[PDB]
Design an enzyme around this catalytic site. Structure first.
Site, PDB file in Angstrom:
ATOM      1  N   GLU A 120       8.254  58.842  59.084  1.00 52.45           N
ATOM      2  CA  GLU A 120       9.042  58.320  57.994  1.00 52.45           C
ATOM      3  C   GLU A 120       9.803  57.112  58.502  1.00 52.45           C
ATOM      4  OE1 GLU A 120      11.954  61.031  56.483  1.00 52.45           O
ATOM      5  OE2 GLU A 120      12.346  59.843  54.712  1.00 52.45           O
ATOM      6  N   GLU A 205      19.439  58.447  47.948  1.00 53.98           N
ATOM      7  CA  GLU A 205      19.613  59.838  48.312  1.00 53.98           C
ATOM      8  C   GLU A 205      21.012  60.238  47.906  1.00 53.98           C
ATOM      9  OE1 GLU A 205      18.216  59.710  52.631  1.00 53.98           O
ATOM     10  OE2 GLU A 205      17.196  61.436  51.835  1.00 53.98           O
TER      11      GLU A 205
END
Length: 224
Positions: A120, A205
């Site tokens: 990631e 997020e």
């Protein structure tokens, strides 16, 4: 809004982009909800927003609503020459636990599902409320005209590289994500020749706080 995606995993796609009310961690929340709105698809980009409020589990991400560039599977990172992208956004408040970030997954298995991968790569444009990325601080890196604090760690077996702004936020940003991958390939042994692009996204997020609203004034992403 042209579309209101207030259901869990509410989804839209069009013009080679997709949008998801990606409340993947909500079951750690003790109250709250979130909706993702498609505001427009003007000028080869996407305009979208997300409103939310969440309580409980301040170290747990409740969601990462995102816009993603749709891609065909099997593109090795080494054979992607460029991933030019730009984003303009605002948050209505910063007294929240949340970020704004690009998220990119890669995997040796080109068919790896879109929830993760072998690696990631995140590029954070905001870091509010005292949150931390995955892992630990590694070093500073100069890319995209800025200096980044690179953090590295693992989420399960997935190695996570997060490039963070040392201070403040970056509400108007452009870069070529390949510069970040190239940096990782050179100095971190990132195996670009065997990793396939899985997702290419920007979003926020959301941990706790709100009511808050993220507005993406514009997002564009290309790759060649």
């Amino acid at each position: 809004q042209i579309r209101s995606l207030c259901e869990l995993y509410g989804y839209w796609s069009g013009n080679g982009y997709e949008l998801l009310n990606n409340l993947w961690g909500k079951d750690t929340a003790t109250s709250g909800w979130q909706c993702t709105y498609l505001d427009g698809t003007n000028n080869g980009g996407i305009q979208w927003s997300t409103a939310w409020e969440w309580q409980g589990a301040p170290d747990n991400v409740k969601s990462y609503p995102y816009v993603g560039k749709q891609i065909q599977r099997g593109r090795k990172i080494s054979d992607i020459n460029s991933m030019r992208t730009s984003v303009s956004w605002t948050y209505d408040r910063t007294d929240i636990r949340a970020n704004v970030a690009y998220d990119v997954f890669t995997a040796r298995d080109p068919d790896h599902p879109n929830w993760g991968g072998d690696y990631e790569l995140m590029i954070w444009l905001a870091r509010y409320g005292g949150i931390y990325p995955i892992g630990t601080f590694h070093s500073q890196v100069n890319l995209a005209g800025r200096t980044w604090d690179l953090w590295t760690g693992y989420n399960g077996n997935m190695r996570v590289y997060s490039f963070l702004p040392p201070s403040g936020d970056i509400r108007d940003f452009s870069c070529d994500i390949k510069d970040f991958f190239n940096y990782l390939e050179r100095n971190h042994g990132y195996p670009a020749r065997e990793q396939n692009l899985i997702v290419y996204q920007v979003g926020t997020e959301c941990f706790t706080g709100g009511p808050a609203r993220f507005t993406c004034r514009d997002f564009r992403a290309d790759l060649w």
